[PDB]
Every structure is written in structure tokens, then in C-alpha cells.
Design a protein around this ligand. Structure first.
Ligand SMILES: Nc1ncnc2c1ncn2[C@@H]1O[C@H](COP(=O)(O)OP(=O)(O)OC[C@H]2NC[C@H](O)[C@@H]2O)[C@@H](O)[C@H]1O
Ligand SMILES: [Cl-]
Ligand SMILES: [Cl-]
Length: 141
């Protein structure tokens, strides 16, 4: 399985894992799991400065690993398309490969406030990450 599921706190995953979640170009991160990424890691200024757009990924390097901000939409209030999620995931994959990331932890990205369906997102993750050695762990409370 590409994806392993864990019930609990995403933020208690291994300190060596890289992390991922979805935000907008606005980097407001005011709700959902995002507000917890904001509290824990900050970095809003640095993220804004990367000037990443829908379908891209912004990245913070912290403690030797990476925190991926999947930029899946323009405004905080928008809802993403599957196409832009997929492009952001592909951007993360490319960065992972180039930088030797092998272990990612994430929530059920796109499938809370952003209204996507995990039956689709899971399959998308499997298709995007096939033929890599990148192990994904998905957390839920
Ligand atoms: N506080 C908290 N703890 C743990 N898991 C949570 C929490 N809040 C939401 N979730 C879960 O995280 C999953 C993803 O939902 P959400 O956090 O709403 O992320 P989306 O990717 O759907 O939406 C992203 C958008 N919301 C704020 C961002 O900046 C984006 O604008 C999902 O299963 C939610 O139930
Ligand atoms: Cl946002
Ligand atoms: Cl900063």
C-alpha cells in the first residue's frame, strides 16, 4: 500500500517525516488543519515570498525536513479543482525526488473544507506516487 492510515495527531508523526497540507495563494490558513500548521510552524512571510500559484507547492525547510503547502486554489474561500490538486501533488513529488524525501505524512488533504472526496484523492495519490519509494501516511482524528 502506498498509503498507511493512522488514527491520531498528524503532528505526533515522526520528526523526520515531511508534512503536507492544502492552502490557497492567500496563505491565510485560518481554519481546518491549516490553522494548526500556522500555529506550529509559522513562516507566512517566507511562504508569501515564494509567490506560488494554484497547482504549485510552497515549501518550508525545518529541522532537516520539509513542510509542503499545496497551493490548490487562489482565494481562501474558493474550492479547488481535482486538476489543481493533482498539479500541486506532482510539484511536491518532484521536490521530494530531487531532495531525497521518502516519508510524507498528511491529513485527508482536500477532503474537509475543500469538499473533495477521499475516494478520489486517495486514488490520485496512488497514481501520482506510483514508481517512487515515497511512503505516505494519512492521519485522521
Ligand atoms: N483541527 C484539526 N485537527 C486534525 N484534523 C483536522 C482538523 N481540522 C480539520 N481536520 C481534518 O483534516 C482533513 C482536511 O480538512 P481541512 O483541514 O479542512 O483541509 P482541506 O484541504 O479540505 O481545506 C484546505 C483549506 N482550509 C484551510 C486552508 O488554508 C485551505 O483554505 C480532514 O479530514 C479534516 O477533518
Ligand atoms: Cl489559505
Ligand atoms: Cl517567515
Amino acid at each position: 500500500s502506498r498509503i498507511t492510515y493512522v488514527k491520531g495527531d498528524l503532528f505526533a508523526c515522526p520528526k523526520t517525516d515531511s508534512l503536507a497540507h492544502c492552502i490557497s495563494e492567500d496563505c491565510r490558513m485560518g481554519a481546518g488543519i491549516a490553522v494548526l500548521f500556522k500555529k506550529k510552524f509559522g513562516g507566512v512571510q517566507e511562504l508569501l515570498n515564494q509567490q506560488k500559484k494554484s497547482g504549485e507547492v510552497a515549501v518550508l525547510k525545518r529541522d532537516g525536513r520539509y513542510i509542503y503547502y499545496l497551493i490548490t486554489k487562489k482565494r481562501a474561500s474558493h474550492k479547488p479543482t481535482y486538476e489543481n490538486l493533482q498539479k500541486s501533488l506532482e510539484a511536491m513529488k518532484s521536490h521530494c525526488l530531487k531532495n531525497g524525501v521518502t516519508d510524507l505524512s498528511m491529513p485527508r488533504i482536500g477532503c474537509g473544507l475543500d469538499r473533495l472526496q477521499w475516494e478520489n484523492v486517495s486514488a490520485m495519490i496512488e497514481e501520482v506516487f506510483e514508481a517512487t519509494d515515497i511512503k505516505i501516511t494519512v492521519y485522521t482524528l
